[PDB]
Amino acid sequence: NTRVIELFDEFTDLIRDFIVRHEITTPEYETIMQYMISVGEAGEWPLWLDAFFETTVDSVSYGKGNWTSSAIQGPFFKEGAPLLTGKPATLPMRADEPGDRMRFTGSVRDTSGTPITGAVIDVWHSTNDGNYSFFSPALPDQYLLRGRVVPAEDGSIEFHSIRPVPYEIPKAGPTGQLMNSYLGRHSWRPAHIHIRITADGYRPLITQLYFEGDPYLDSDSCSAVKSELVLPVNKIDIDGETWQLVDFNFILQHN
Amino acid sequence: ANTRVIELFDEFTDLIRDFIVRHEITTPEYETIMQYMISVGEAGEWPLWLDAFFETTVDSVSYGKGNWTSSAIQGPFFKEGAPLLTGKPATLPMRADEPGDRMRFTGSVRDTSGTPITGAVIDVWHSTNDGNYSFFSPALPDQYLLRGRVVPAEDGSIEFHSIRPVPYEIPKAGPTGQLMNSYLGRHSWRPAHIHIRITADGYRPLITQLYFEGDPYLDSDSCSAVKSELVLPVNKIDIDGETWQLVDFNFILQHN
Ligand SMILES: Oc1cc(Cl)cc(Cl)c1O
Ligand SMILES: [Fe+3]
């Protein structure tokens, strides 16, 4: 209420000032209004807002230091994921899964460098097909390439899955329309894998990890890229199946 | 890809991002913002919302002051295709026993040089006293009520009749209403206004609004669309034991 008065008026002055400086004409104004009505008539608001701004909303709420870097949450988020204690600890995947086989390896330590046994690491990512879990007419609503993973008591974590590939935001919806058509660019996101991490007495982390030589690194449609988060790739041909091995050392909050 | 859009949008994103940073806009603040947006769309309230907070500004950069009638914001309640009012005393279509004081509006349309523009067509629209515009209220049918078109006579005079508008209040229940009332501790009343559009071959179309002298809300328009050259004196008159309100205004169009 007093906070919204502050921002709202500060916001207002700013847009008005934009209209005045750029002499926004009526047809223009009307084209914006129609456009916004679009975005809402589809369901792309969270899509649209997260794609341009949440990278910034994250660089403020969490912070910007040796905390291992934060990345956008993203509409695709998994709630109530399944616990995993598998043999080499695979993620749930439809049999004879296309895509490169992938192995992630890493840790959960803090400031000091001592493991935080009480951690819970939630992971999710798209198919090689370019479709996420739950929501796509081509996929069941059932937990696939999503899950919750506990670290070892020394800290270390590991899981198997498949190698994600760059997803493009629909070339056809208002957001894509903007990225592709009117702005004349691309709506591709670099191949990434999502991560959340919970604990007792630690601030939660939410982020992504990308890959080296990812074509859309230096042009993420959602601007969620940092340097600290681009992973080194180890190409190993366990023959028939070719493998991709990756490492990461997640550090955390501290309440 | 328009460079207009390219250059503008880019600056726009920089602006908004600096804003987030300058004001330490938090995740739960951001989620509230996003949620409010969604709610605005669902109330189908984007035109009401943008015109309210911004049309004034676009209007002020997109048509001049000078010796022609001042423009003012169109707002979200215009509809094309209102009927030609033809008649012994033209009257806006109205429901039976429509609440409110008979008003009679007189005036004319001329050019910046005094010539009557007999080719003008004047659209007029306003709300009901109950505070509703036809085509934009589930409480009114999608028919032309309090909307119509008037033409000048060979000599330039316009004349129509109608109920008298009264101050309108953007609905407190809706997203916009919440914003203004609850969140900003401000009201959401506009003052009584007649909406006008005049078009005519040869001339630049005029979209303006007319207000009433003494209106409780002149100095407090929620939408901030009032202009003094646009404030009509009202003249109370009795005819056949009838409290008519006279309101007169002389429009001047620009050439082109
Ligand atoms: O012409 C109007 C414009 C806006 Cl924004 C709001 C109302 Cl209530 C109007 O009557
Ligand atoms: Fe993703």
Coordinates of all heavy atoms in Angstrom, one line a residue, chain A residues 1 3-5 7-11 14-16 18-22 24 26 28-29 33 36-37 45-46 48-50 52-54 56-57 60 178 181-185, chain B residues 1-2 4 6 8-12 15-17 19-21 23-25 27 29-30 34 37-38 46-47 49-51 53-54 57-58 61-62 179 182-184 186:
Chain A
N1 N 0.9 -1.2 0.0 CA 0.0 0.0 0.0 C 0.9 1.3 0.0 O 1.0 1.9 -1.0 CB -1.1 0.0 1.1 CG -1.9 1.3 1.2 OD1 -1.4 2.3 0.8 ND2 -3.1 1.2 1.7
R3 N 4.1 1.1 -0.1 CA 5.1 0.6 -1.0 C 4.7 0.7 -2.5 O 5.4 1.2 -3.4 CB 5.7 -0.7 -0.6 CG 6.5 -1.5 -1.7 CD 7.9 -0.9 -1.8 NE 8.7 -1.9 -2.5 CZ 9.9 -1.8 -2.9 NH1 10.5 -0.6 -2.7 NH2 10.6 -2.7 -3.5
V4 N 3.5 0.1 -2.8 CA 2.9 0.3 -4.1 C 2.6 1.7 -4.6 O 2.8 2.0 -5.8 CB 1.7 -0.6 -4.3 CG1 1.6 -1.7 -3.2 CG2 0.4 0.3 -4.2
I5 N 2.3 2.6 -3.6 CA 2.1 4.0 -4.0 C 3.4 4.5 -4.5 O 3.4 5.2 -5.5 CB 1.5 5.0 -2.8 CG1 0.1 4.8 -2.5 CG2 1.6 6.4 -3.2 CD1 -0.4 5.1 -1.1
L7 N 6.1 3.0 -5.8 CA 6.6 2.4 -7.1 C 5.6 2.8 -8.2 O 6.0 3.2 -9.3 CB 6.7 0.9 -7.0 CG 7.6 0.3 -6.0 CD1 8.0 -1.2 -6.4 CD2 8.9 1.1 -5.8
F8 N 4.3 2.7 -7.9 CA 3.4 2.9 -8.9 C 3.6 4.3 -9.5 O 3.5 4.5 -10.8 CB 1.9 2.8 -8.5 CG 1.0 2.8 -9.7 CD1 1.1 1.8 -10.7 CD2 0.1 3.8 -9.8 CE1 0.3 1.9 -11.8 CE2 -0.8 3.8 -11.0 CZ -0.6 2.9 -12.0
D9 N 3.9 5.3 -8.7 CA 4.0 6.7 -9.2 C 5.2 6.9 -9.9 O 5.3 7.7 -10.8 CB 3.8 7.7 -8.0 CG 2.3 7.6 -7.5 OD1 1.4 7.2 -8.2 OD2 2.2 8.0 -6.3
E10 N 6.3 6.2 -9.4 CA 7.6 6.2 -10.0 C 7.5 5.5 -11.3 O 8.0 6.0 -12.3 CB 8.6 5.6 -9.0 CG 10.0 5.8 -9.4 CD 10.6 7.0 -8.7 OE1 9.8 7.8 -8.1 OE2 11.8 7.2 -8.7
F11 N 6.8 4.4 -11.4 CA 6.6 3.7 -12.6 C 5.8 4.6 -13.7 O 6.3 4.8 -14.8 CB 5.8 2.4 -12.4 CG 5.5 1.6 -13.6 CD1 6.6 1.0 -14.3 CD2 4.2 1.3 -14.1 CE1 6.4 0.2 -15.5 CE2 4.0 0.6 -15.2 CZ 5.1 0.0 -15.9
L14 N 7.7 7.4 -15.4 CA 8.7 6.8 -16.3 C 8.1 6.4 -17.6 O 8.6 6.8 -18.7 CB 9.2 5.6 -15.5 CG 10.2 4.5 -16.1 CD1 11.6 5.2 -16.4 CD2 10.3 3.4 -15.2
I15 N 6.9 5.7 -17.6 CA 6.2 5.4 -18.9 C 5.7 6.7 -19.5 O 5.8 6.8 -20.7 CB 5.1 4.4 -18.6 CG1 5.5 3.1 -18.0 CG2 4.3 4.2 -19.9 CD1 6.4 2.3 -19.0
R16 N 5.2 7.6 -18.7 CA 4.7 8.8 -19.3 C 5.8 9.6 -20.0 O 5.7 10.0 -21.2 CB 4.1 9.8 -18.3 CG 3.0 9.2 -17.5 CD 1.9 10.2 -17.2 NE 0.8 9.5 -16.6 CZ 0.5 9.6 -15.3 NH1 1.3 10.3 -14.5 NH2 -0.6 8.9 -14.8
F18 N 8.5 8.2 -21.2 CA 8.8 7.5 -22.4 C 7.9 7.9 -23.6 O 8.4 8.1 -24.7 CB 8.7 6.0 -22.2 CG 9.2 5.1 -23.3 CD1 10.5 4.7 -23.3 CD2 8.3 4.8 -24.3 CE1 11.0 3.9 -24.4 CE2 8.8 4.0 -25.4 CZ 10.1 3.5 -25.5
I19 N 6.6 8.0 -23.3 CA 5.6 8.4 -24.3 C 5.9 9.8 -24.8 O 5.9 10.0 -26.1 CB 4.1 8.4 -23.7 CG1 3.6 6.9 -23.5 CG2 3.2 9.1 -24.6 CD1 2.8 6.8 -22.3
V20 N 6.3 10.7 -23.9 CA 6.5 12.1 -24.3 C 7.8 12.2 -25.1 O 7.7 12.8 -26.2 CB 6.5 13.1 -23.1 CG1 6.7 14.5 -23.6 CG2 5.2 13.0 -22.3
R21 N 8.9 11.6 -24.6 CA 10.2 11.7 -25.3 C 10.1 11.0 -26.7 O 10.6 11.5 -27.7 CB 11.3 11.0 -24.5 CG 11.8 11.9 -23.3 CD 12.5 11.0 -22.3 NE 13.3 10.0 -22.9 CZ 13.3 8.7 -22.6 NH1 12.5 8.2 -21.7 NH2 14.1 7.9 -23.3
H22 N 9.4 9.9 -26.8 CA 9.4 9.3 -28.1 C 8.1 9.6 -28.9 O 7.9 9.0 -30.0 CB 9.6 7.8 -27.9 CG 10.9 7.4 -27.4 ND1 12.1 7.7 -28.1 CD2 11.3 6.8 -26.3 CE1 13.1 7.2 -27.4 NE2 12.7 6.7 -26.3
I24 N 5.0 8.9 -28.7 CA 4.2 7.8 -29.0 C 2.8 8.2 -29.6 O 2.1 8.9 -28.9 CB 4.0 6.8 -27.8 CG1 5.4 6.3 -27.3 CG2 3.2 5.6 -28.2 CD1 6.2 5.6 -28.4
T26 N -0.9 7.7 -31.6 CA -2.1 7.0 -31.2 C -2.1 5.6 -31.8 O -2.2 4.6 -31.1 CB -3.5 7.7 -31.5 OG1 -3.6 8.9 -30.7 CG2 -4.6 6.8 -31.2
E28 N 0.3 3.8 -32.7 CA 1.3 3.1 -31.9 C 0.7 2.6 -30.6 O 0.9 1.5 -30.2 CB 2.5 4.0 -31.7 CG 3.3 4.2 -32.9 CD 4.4 5.2 -32.8 OE1 4.4 5.9 -31.9 OE2 5.2 5.2 -33.7
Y29 N 0.1 3.6 -29.9 CA -0.4 3.3 -28.5 C -1.4 2.1 -28.6 O -1.4 1.2 -27.8 CB -1.1 4.5 -28.0 CG -1.9 4.4 -26.8 CD1 -1.3 4.1 -25.5 CD2 -3.3 4.4 -26.8 CE1 -2.0 4.0 -24.4 CE2 -4.0 4.3 -25.6 CZ -3.3 4.1 -24.4 OH -4.1 3.9 -23.2
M33 N -1.5 -1.7 -27.0 CA -2.6 -2.1 -26.1 C -3.1 -3.4 -26.7 O -3.3 -4.4 -25.9 CB -3.7 -1.0 -26.2 CG -5.0 -1.4 -25.6 SD -6.3 -0.2 -25.7 CE -5.4 1.3 -25.1
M36 N -0.6 -6.2 -25.8 CA -0.7 -6.7 -24.5 C -1.9 -7.6 -24.3 O -1.9 -8.6 -23.5 CB -0.7 -5.5 -23.5 CG 0.6 -4.7 -23.4 SD 0.4 -3.3 -22.3 CE -0.2 -4.1 -20.8
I37 N -3.0 -7.3 -24.9 CA -4.3 -8.0 -24.8 C -4.1 -9.4 -25.4 O -4.5 -10.4 -24.8 CB -5.4 -7.3 -25.5 CG1 -5.6 -6.0 -24.7 CG2 -6.7 -8.1 -25.5 CD1 -6.4 -4.9 -25.5
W45 N 1.8 -14.3 -20.1 CA 2.3 -13.3 -19.2 C 3.5 -13.8 -18.4 O 4.6 -13.2 -18.6 CB 1.2 -12.7 -18.3 CG 0.6 -11.5 -19.0 CD1 -0.8 -11.3 -19.1 CD2 1.2 -10.4 -19.6 NE1 -1.0 -10.2 -19.8 CE2 0.2 -9.6 -20.2 CE3 2.5 -10.0 -19.8 CZ2 0.4 -8.4 -20.9 CZ3 2.8 -8.9 -20.5 CH2 1.8 -8.1 -21.0
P46 N 3.4 -14.9 -17.7 CA 4.6 -15.5 -17.0 C 5.6 -15.8 -18.0 O 6.8 -15.6 -17.8 CB 4.0 -16.7 -16.3 CG 2.5 -16.6 -16.3 CD 2.2 -15.8 -17.5
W48 N 6.1 -14.2 -20.9 CA 6.6 -12.9 -21.3 C 7.4 -12.2 -20.3 O 8.6 -11.8 -20.6 CB 5.5 -12.0 -21.8 CG 5.9 -11.0 -22.9 CD1 5.8 -11.1 -24.2 CD2 6.4 -9.7 -22.6 NE1 6.2 -10.0 -24.8 CE2 6.6 -9.1 -23.9 CE3 6.7 -9.0 -21.4 CZ2 7.1 -7.8 -24.0 CZ3 7.2 -7.7 -21.6 CH2 7.4 -7.1 -22.8
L49 N 6.9 -12.0 -19.1 CA 7.6 -11.4 -18.0 C 8.9 -12.1 -17.7 O 9.9 -11.4 -17.4 CB 6.7 -11.2 -16.8 CG 5.6 -10.2 -17.0 CD1 4.4 -10.5 -16.1 CD2 6.1 -8.8 -16.9
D50 N 9.0 -13.4 -17.6 CA 10.1 -14.2 -17.1 C 11.2 -14.1 -18.2 O 12.4 -14.1 -17.8 CB 9.8 -15.6 -16.8 CG 8.6 -15.8 -15.8 OD1 7.7 -14.9 -15.7 OD2 8.5 -16.8 -15.1
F52 N 12.0 -11.6 -20.1 CA 12.7 -10.3 -20.3 C 13.2 -9.7 -19.0 O 14.2 -9.0 -19.0 CB 11.8 -9.3 -20.9 CG 11.5 -9.5 -22.3 CD1 10.2 -9.7 -22.8 CD2 12.6 -9.5 -23.2 CE1 9.9 -9.8 -24.2 CE2 12.3 -9.7 -24.6 CZ 11.0 -9.9 -25.1
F53 N 12.6 -10.1 -17.9 CA 12.8 -9.4 -16.6 C 13.3 -10.3 -15.4 O 14.0 -9.8 -14.6 CB 11.6 -8.6 -16.2 CG 11.2 -7.5 -17.2 CD1 9.8 -7.4 -17.6 CD2 12.1 -6.7 -17.8 CE1 9.4 -6.4 -18.5 CE2 11.7 -5.7 -18.8 CZ 10.4 -5.6 -19.1
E54 N 12.8 -11.5 -15.2 CA 13.1 -12.3 -14.0 C 14.6 -12.5 -13.7 O 15.0 -12.6 -12.6 CB 12.3 -13.7 -13.9 CG 12.6 -14.5 -12.6 CD 11.6 -15.7 -12.4 OE1 11.3 -16.5 -13.3 OE2 11.0 -15.8 -11.2
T56 N 16.6 -10.3 -13.8 CA 16.9 -9.1 -13.1 C 16.3 -9.2 -11.7 O 17.0 -8.9 -10.7 CB 16.3 -7.8 -13.7 OG1 17.0 -7.6 -15.0 CG2 16.6 -6.6 -12.9
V57 N 15.0 -9.6 -11.6 CA 14.4 -9.8 -10.4 C 15.2 -10.8 -9.5 O 15.2 -10.6 -8.2 CB 12.9 -10.4 -10.5 CG1 12.2 -10.4 -9.2 CG2 12.2 -9.6 -11.6
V60 N 18.6 -9.5 -7.7 CA 18.3 -8.5 -6.6 C 17.8 -9.2 -5.3 O 18.3 -8.9 -4.3 CB 17.2 -7.4 -7.1 CG1 16.9 -6.4 -6.0 CG2 17.7 -6.7 -8.3
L178 N 7.2 -11.4 -31.1 CA 8.0 -10.3 -30.7 C 9.5 -10.6 -30.9 O 10.2 -9.9 -31.6 CB 7.8 -9.9 -29.3 CG 8.5 -8.7 -28.6 CD1 8.0 -7.4 -29.1 CD2 8.3 -8.8 -27.1
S181 N 9.7 -12.1 -35.1 CA 9.2 -11.2 -36.2 C 9.5 -9.7 -36.0 O 10.3 -9.2 -36.8 CB 7.6 -11.5 -36.4 OG 7.1 -10.8 -37.5
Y182 N 8.9 -9.1 -35.0 CA 9.0 -7.6 -34.8 C 10.4 -7.1 -34.4 O 10.8 -6.0 -34.8 CB 8.0 -7.1 -33.8 CG 6.6 -7.6 -33.8 CD1 6.0 -8.2 -32.7 CD2 5.8 -7.6 -35.0 CE1 4.8 -8.8 -32.7 CE2 4.5 -8.1 -35.0 CZ 4.0 -8.7 -33.9 OH 2.7 -9.2 -33.8
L183 N 11.0 -7.9 -33.6 CA 12.4 -7.6 -33.2 C 13.4 -8.2 -34.1 O 14.6 -7.9 -34.1 CB 12.7 -8.0 -31.7 CG 12.1 -7.3 -30.5 CD1 12.7 -7.8 -29.2 CD2 12.4 -5.7 -30.6
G184 N 12.9 -9.1 -34.9 CA 13.7 -9.8 -36.0 C 14.9 -10.5 -35.4 O 16.0 -10.4 -36.0
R185 N 14.7 -11.3 -34.4 CA 15.8 -12.1 -33.8 C 15.3 -13.6 -33.6 O 14.5 -14.1 -34.4 CB 16.2 -11.5 -32.4 CG 16.9 -10.2 -32.5 CD 16.7 -9.4 -31.2 NE 17.3 -8.1 -31.1 CZ 17.0 -7.2 -30.2 NH1 16.1 -7.4 -29.2 NH2 17.6 -6.0 -30.3
Chain B
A1 N 10.7 -6.5 -39.2 CA 11.3 -5.8 -38.0 C 11.5 -4.3 -38.1 O 12.4 -3.8 -38.8 CB 12.6 -6.5 -37.6
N2 N 10.7 -3.5 -37.4 CA 10.8 -2.1 -37.4 C 11.9 -1.6 -36.4 O 11.9 -2.1 -35.3 CB 9.4 -1.4 -37.1 CG 9.4 0.1 -37.5 OD1 10.4 0.7 -37.9 ND2 8.2 0.7 -37.4
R4 N 11.9 1.3 -35.2 CA 11.0 1.9 -34.2 C 10.9 0.9 -33.1 O 11.4 1.1 -32.0 CB 9.6 2.1 -34.8 CG 9.2 3.6 -34.9 CD 8.5 4.1 -33.7 NE 9.1 5.3 -33.2 CZ 8.6 6.3 -32.4 NH1 7.3 6.2 -32.1 NH2 9.3 7.3 -32.0
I6 N 12.5 -1.8 -32.6 CA 13.7 -2.4 -32.1 C 14.3 -1.4 -31.1 O 14.5 -1.8 -29.9 CB 14.7 -2.8 -33.2 CG1 14.2 -4.0 -34.0 CG2 16.1 -3.1 -32.6 CD1 14.8 -4.2 -35.3
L8 N 13.0 1.2 -29.6 CA 12.1 1.5 -28.5 C 12.1 0.4 -27.5 O 12.4 0.7 -26.3 CB 10.7 1.9 -28.9 CG 10.5 3.2 -29.6 CD1 9.0 3.5 -29.9 CD2 11.2 4.4 -29.0
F9 N 11.8 -0.8 -27.9 CA 11.6 -1.9 -27.0 C 12.9 -2.1 -26.2 O 12.8 -2.3 -24.9 CB 11.2 -3.2 -27.7 CG 11.0 -4.3 -26.8 CD1 9.7 -4.4 -26.2 CD2 11.9 -5.3 -26.6 CE1 9.5 -5.5 -25.3 CE2 11.7 -6.4 -25.8 CZ 10.5 -6.5 -25.1
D10 N 14.0 -2.0 -26.8 CA 15.3 -2.1 -26.2 C 15.5 -1.2 -25.0 O 15.8 -1.6 -23.9 CB 16.5 -2.0 -27.2 CG 16.7 -3.4 -27.9 OD1 16.6 -4.5 -27.2 OD2 17.1 -3.4 -29.1
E11 N 15.3 0.1 -25.3 CA 15.3 1.2 -24.3 C 14.3 0.9 -23.2 O 14.5 1.0 -22.0 CB 15.0 2.5 -24.9 CG 15.4 3.6 -23.9 CD 14.8 5.0 -24.3 OE1 15.0 5.4 -25.5 OE2 14.2 5.6 -23.4
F12 N 13.1 0.4 -23.6 CA 12.0 0.1 -22.7 C 12.5 -0.9 -21.7 O 12.4 -0.7 -20.5 CB 10.7 -0.3 -23.4 CG 9.7 -0.8 -22.4 CD1 9.0 0.1 -21.6 CD2 9.3 -2.1 -22.4 CE1 8.0 -0.3 -20.7 CE2 8.3 -2.6 -21.6 CZ 7.7 -1.7 -20.7
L15 N 15.0 0.5 -19.3 CA 14.3 1.3 -18.3 C 13.7 0.4 -17.2 O 14.1 0.5 -16.1 CB 13.1 2.1 -18.9 CG 13.4 3.6 -19.4 CD1 14.6 4.3 -18.7 CD2 13.6 3.6 -20.9
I16 N 12.8 -0.6 -17.6 CA 12.2 -1.5 -16.6 C 13.2 -2.2 -15.8 O 13.0 -2.3 -14.5 CB 11.2 -2.4 -17.3 CG1 10.2 -1.6 -18.1 CG2 10.5 -3.3 -16.2 CD1 9.4 -0.6 -17.3
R17 N 14.3 -2.6 -16.3 CA 15.3 -3.3 -15.5 C 16.0 -2.5 -14.5 O 16.2 -2.9 -13.4 CB 16.3 -4.0 -16.4 CG 15.8 -5.2 -17.2 CD 16.9 -6.0 -17.7 NE 16.6 -6.8 -18.9 CZ 16.9 -6.5 -20.1 NH1 17.5 -5.3 -20.3 NH2 16.6 -7.3 -21.1
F19 N 14.7 -0.1 -13.2 CA 13.6 0.2 -12.2 C 13.7 -0.9 -11.1 O 13.9 -0.6 -9.9 CB 12.3 0.3 -12.9 CG 11.2 0.9 -12.0 CD1 11.0 2.2 -11.9 CD2 10.4 0.0 -11.3 CE1 10.0 2.8 -11.1 CE2 9.4 0.5 -10.4 CZ 9.2 1.9 -10.3
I20 N 13.4 -2.2 -11.5 CA 13.7 -3.3 -10.6 C 14.9 -3.2 -9.7 O 14.8 -3.4 -8.4 CB 13.9 -4.6 -11.5 CG1 12.7 -4.7 -12.5 CG2 14.0 -5.8 -10.5 CD1 12.5 -6.0 -13.1
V21 N 16.0 -2.9 -10.3 CA 17.3 -2.7 -9.5 C 17.2 -1.5 -8.6 O 17.4 -1.6 -7.4 CB 18.5 -2.6 -10.5 CG1 19.7 -1.8 -10.0 CG2 19.0 -4.0 -10.9
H23 N 14.7 0.0 -7.2 CA 13.7 -0.1 -6.2 C 13.7 -1.4 -5.4 O 12.8 -1.7 -4.6 CB 12.3 0.2 -6.7 CG 12.2 1.6 -7.2 ND1 12.0 2.7 -6.4 CD2 12.3 2.1 -8.5 CE1 11.9 3.8 -7.1 NE2 12.1 3.5 -8.4
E24 N 14.7 -2.2 -5.7 CA 14.9 -3.5 -5.0 C 13.6 -4.3 -5.1 O 13.1 -4.9 -4.1 CB 15.3 -3.4 -3.6 CG 16.7 -3.9 -3.3 CD 17.0 -4.2 -1.8 OE1 17.2 -3.2 -1.1 OE2 17.0 -5.3 -1.3
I25 N 13.1 -4.4 -6.3 CA 11.8 -5.2 -6.6 C 12.0 -6.7 -6.4 O 12.7 -7.4 -7.1 CB 11.2 -4.9 -8.0 CG1 10.4 -3.5 -7.9 CG2 10.3 -6.0 -8.5 CD1 10.2 -2.8 -9.2
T27 N 11.1 -10.8 -5.6 CA 10.3 -12.0 -6.2 C 8.9 -12.0 -5.8 O 8.0 -12.1 -6.6 CB 11.0 -13.3 -5.9 OG1 12.1 -13.5 -6.9 CG2 10.1 -14.5 -6.0
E29 N 7.2 -9.5 -4.9 CA 6.6 -8.3 -5.4 C 6.4 -8.6 -6.9 O 5.3 -8.4 -7.4 CB 7.5 -7.1 -5.1 CG 7.2 -6.5 -3.7 CD 8.2 -5.4 -3.2 OE1 9.2 -5.0 -3.9 OE2 7.9 -5.0 -2.1
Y30 N 7.4 -9.1 -7.6 CA 7.3 -9.4 -9.0 C 6.1 -10.4 -9.3 O 5.4 -10.2 -10.3 CB 8.6 -10.1 -9.4 CG 8.7 -10.7 -10.8 CD1 8.7 -9.9 -11.9 CD2 8.7 -12.1 -10.9 CE1 8.8 -10.5 -13.2 CE2 8.8 -12.7 -12.2 CZ 8.8 -11.9 -13.3 OH 8.9 -12.5 -14.6
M34 N 3.0 -9.6 -11.8 CA 2.5 -10.6 -12.8 C 1.1 -11.1 -12.5 O 0.3 -11.1 -13.4 CB 3.5 -11.8 -12.8 CG 3.0 -13.0 -13.6 SD 4.4 -14.2 -13.6 CE 3.9 -15.3 -12.3
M37 N -1.3 -8.2 -13.5 CA -1.4 -8.1 -14.9 C -2.5 -9.2 -15.3 O -3.4 -8.8 -16.0 CB -0.1 -8.3 -15.6 CG 0.6 -7.0 -15.9 SD 2.3 -7.0 -16.0 CE 2.6 -7.0 -17.8
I38 N -2.3 -10.4 -14.9 CA -3.2 -11.5 -15.4 C -4.6 -11.1 -15.1 O -5.5 -11.1 -16.0 CB -2.8 -12.9 -14.9 CG1 -1.6 -13.4 -15.7 CG2 -3.9 -13.8 -14.9 CD1 -0.7 -14.3 -14.9
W46 N -7.8 -4.1 -20.0 CA -6.6 -3.4 -20.5 C -6.9 -2.1 -21.1 O -6.3 -1.1 -20.6 CB -5.8 -4.3 -21.4 CG -4.8 -5.2 -20.6 CD1 -4.7 -6.5 -20.6 CD2 -3.8 -4.7 -19.7 NE1 -3.7 -7.0 -19.8 CE2 -3.2 -5.9 -19.2 CE3 -3.4 -3.5 -19.2 CZ2 -2.2 -5.8 -18.2 CZ3 -2.4 -3.4 -18.3 CH2 -1.8 -4.6 -17.8
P47 N -7.9 -1.9 -22.0 CA -8.1 -0.6 -22.5 C -8.5 0.4 -21.4 O -8.0 1.5 -21.4 CB -9.3 -0.8 -23.5 CG -9.3 -2.3 -23.9 CD -8.5 -3.0 -22.8
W49 N -7.6 0.3 -18.3 CA -6.5 0.5 -17.5 C -5.4 1.4 -18.2 O -5.0 2.4 -17.6 CB -5.9 -0.9 -17.0 CG -5.0 -0.8 -15.9 CD1 -5.3 -0.9 -14.6 CD2 -3.6 -0.4 -15.9 NE1 -4.2 -0.7 -13.8 CE2 -3.2 -0.4 -14.5 CE3 -2.7 -0.1 -16.9 CZ2 -1.9 -0.1 -14.2 CZ3 -1.4 0.2 -16.5 CH2 -1.0 0.2 -15.2
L50 N -5.0 1.1 -19.4 CA -4.1 2.0 -20.1 C -4.6 3.4 -20.4 O -3.9 4.4 -20.2 CB -3.6 1.3 -21.4 CG -3.0 -0.1 -21.2 CD1 -2.7 -0.7 -22.6 CD2 -1.7 0.0 -20.4
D51 N -5.9 3.5 -20.9 CA -6.4 4.8 -21.1 C -6.3 5.6 -19.8 O -5.9 6.8 -19.8 CB -7.8 4.8 -21.8 CG -7.8 4.0 -23.1 OD1 -6.8 4.0 -23.9 OD2 -8.9 3.5 -23.4
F53 N -4.4 5.5 -17.1 CA -3.2 6.0 -16.5 C -2.3 6.7 -17.5 O -1.5 7.5 -17.1 CB -2.4 4.8 -15.8 CG -3.1 4.4 -14.5 CD1 -3.8 3.1 -14.5 CD2 -3.2 5.2 -13.4 CE1 -4.5 2.7 -13.3 CE2 -3.9 4.8 -12.3 CZ -4.5 3.6 -12.2
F54 N -2.6 6.4 -18.8 CA -1.8 6.9 -19.9 C -2.3 7.7 -21.2 O -1.6 8.4 -21.9 CB -0.8 5.8 -20.5 CG 0.0 5.2 -19.4 CD1 -0.1 3.9 -19.1 CD2 1.0 6.0 -18.7 CE1 0.7 3.3 -18.1 CE2 1.8 5.5 -17.7 CZ 1.6 4.1 -17.4
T57 N -1.4 11.3 -21.9 CA 0.0 11.6 -22.2 C 0.2 11.5 -23.7 O 0.6 12.5 -24.3 CB 1.0 10.8 -21.4 OG1 0.8 11.1 -20.0 CG2 2.4 11.2 -21.7
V58 N -0.2 10.3 -24.3 CA -0.3 10.2 -25.7 C -1.1 11.3 -26.5 O -0.6 11.8 -27.5 CB -0.5 8.7 -26.2 CG1 -0.6 7.7 -25.1 CG2 -1.7 8.6 -27.1
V61 N 0.9 14.6 -26.8 CA 1.9 14.7 -27.8 C 1.4 14.5 -29.2 O 2.1 14.7 -30.1 CB 3.1 13.7 -27.5 CG1 3.7 13.9 -26.1 CG2 2.7 12.3 -27.8
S62 N 0.1 14.1 -29.3 CA -0.4 13.7 -30.7 C -1.5 14.5 -31.3 O -2.1 14.1 -32.3 CB -0.7 12.2 -30.7 OG -1.9 12.0 -30.0
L179 N -6.7 -1.2 -7.7 CA -5.5 -0.3 -7.7 C -5.8 1.1 -7.2 O -5.2 1.5 -6.2 CB -5.0 -0.2 -9.2 CG -3.7 0.6 -9.4 CD1 -2.7 0.3 -8.3 CD2 -3.1 0.2 -10.7
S182 N -8.3 0.8 -3.2 CA -7.6 0.1 -2.1 C -6.1 0.4 -2.0 O -5.6 1.0 -1.1 CB -7.9 -1.4 -2.1 OG -9.2 -1.6 -1.5
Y183 N -5.4 -0.1 -3.1 CA -3.9 0.1 -3.0 C -3.4 1.5 -3.0 O -2.3 1.8 -2.4 CB -3.3 -0.7 -4.2 CG -3.8 -2.1 -4.3 CD1 -4.3 -2.6 -5.5 CD2 -3.8 -3.0 -3.2 CE1 -4.7 -3.9 -5.7 CE2 -4.3 -4.3 -3.3 CZ -4.7 -4.8 -4.6 OH -5.2 -6.0 -4.7
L184 N -4.0 2.5 -3.7 CA -3.4 3.9 -3.8 C -4.2 4.9 -2.8 O -3.8 6.0 -2.8 CB -3.4 4.4 -5.2 CG -2.7 3.5 -6.3 CD1 -3.1 4.1 -7.7 CD2 -1.2 3.2 -6.2
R186 N -6.9 6.3 -3.2 CA -7.4 7.4 -4.0 C -8.7 7.0 -4.6 O -9.1 5.8 -4.5 CB -6.4 7.7 -5.2 CG -5.1 8.3 -4.7 CD -4.1 8.4 -5.9 NE -2.7 8.4 -5.4 CZ -1.6 8.2 -6.1 NH1 -1.7 8.0 -7.4 NH2 -0.4 8.3 -5.5

